[PDB]
Amino acid sequence: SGAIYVGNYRVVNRHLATHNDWANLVWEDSSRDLLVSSTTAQGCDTIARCDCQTGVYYCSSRRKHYPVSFSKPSLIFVEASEYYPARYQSHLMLAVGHSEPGDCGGILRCQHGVVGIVSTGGNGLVGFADVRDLLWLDEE
């Protein structure tokens, strides 16, 4: 579990969005596993606006933050799970690291701010849904 809080927005994994998120929807994209809902109070996370390929992510299944190298956002085949059939997920970045289903939502951060959130895993890999291209998160 986990979310990004920027301005009057809450960014979560689409597959983990609550009834309250759908009842206050801003934008969602099934192919990216992202959903953004509106909030009453202002958030303080800063979104990174960069091309960094190294950062640190939080892994709830280990209660630990790990430094990682990760690939550039791409269209990657993701195996079927209980939330989606087998499909290409877009804007996804992979790293070598531990990830379990409940780790989705963990933040990946570089020196510039929040890069994305854990969205995929298995086989000793962890995938992150990129949020750096969502420039509108910084306004309105």
Ligand X SMILES: NC(=O)[C@H]1CCN(C(=O)Cc2cc(C(F)(F)F)ccc2Cl)C1
Interface with ligand X by CB under 6 A: which residues? Answer: 15, 33, 78, 81, 83-84, 89, 99-101, 104, 119-122
For residues 44 and 122, what is the distance between their CA atoms, to the nearest angstrom? Answer: 31
Given a contact cutoff of 8 angstroms between Cβ atoms, the answer to whether 57 and 108 are in contact is yes
Which residue, 46 or 60, has its beta carbon nearer to ligand X?
Answer: 60
Q: Name the site residues for Zn ion (rule: CB under 5 A).
A: 48, 50, 52, 110, 112
CB proximity list for 136: less than 8 A, separation 6 or greater = none
Minimum distance between the CB of residue 36 and Zn ion, rounded to whole angstroms?
Answer: 21
Minimum distance between the CB of residue 8 and ligand X, rounded to whole angstroms?
Answer: 25
Given Zn ion, ligand X, none, residue 50, with its beta carbon under 5 to 8 Å by kind, binds Zn ion
- Closest-CB residue for ligand X? 122
Give the torsion sign (CA, 85, 86, 91, 93).
Answer: positive
Q: Among the options 21, 33, 103, 130, which is catalytic?
A: 33
33 is catalytic: yes
Which residue, 38 or 54, has its beta carbon nearer to Zn ion?
Answer: 54
Q: Among the options 15, 45, 65, 98, which is catalytic?
A: 15
Q: Is 52 annotated as a binding residue?
A: yes
21 is catalytic: no
Given a contact cutoff of 8 angstroms between Cβ atoms, the answer to whether 2 and 11 are in contact is no
Q: Is 112 annotated as a binding residue?
A: yes
For residues 39 and 4, what is the distance between their CA atoms, to the nearest angstrom? Answer: 11
CA 37 remoteness from chain centre: 14
Given a contact cutoff of 8 angstroms between Cβ atoms, the answer to whether 127 and 117 are in contact is no
44 is catalytic: no
Binding residues for Zn(2+): 50, 52, 110, 112
